[PDB]
Design a protein around this nucleic acid. Structure first.
Length: 70
RNA sequence: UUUUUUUUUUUUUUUUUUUUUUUUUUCUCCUCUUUUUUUUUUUU
């Protein structure tokens, strides 16, 4: 939690653009038919893991660019 | 006290052959309406 919160702190001191999408989820029972629909949401932990893997993939790409130029 | 005679079931067998699924019609034809076309992002 702390690590993610403050990787966020830094890379927003840089300043990202965090926006959203109009996404909805669907539950399907035994009969395979619509019990209900439910709007889904972005959760704190989604943001955490999103930034952890952003930084990860970022260092990955750095390594692999400086390692193989063209 | 009533003798004698009036044929019967066609003859024949020791002939060659080098093709081939099907088969043969039917004309030109007014697709109705918020749009450029949205787009990063993350959790599968």
């Amino acid at each position: 939690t702390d690590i993610a919160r403050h990787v966020r702190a830094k890379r927003d001191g840089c300043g990202a653009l965090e926006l959203e999408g109009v996404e909805v989820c669907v539950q399907l029972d035994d009969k395979k038919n619509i019990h209900d629909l439910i709007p889904k949401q972005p959760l704190e932990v989604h943001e955490t893991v999103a930034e952890c893997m952003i930084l990860a993939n970022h260092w990955v790409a750095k390594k692999i660019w400086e390692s193989f130029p063209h």
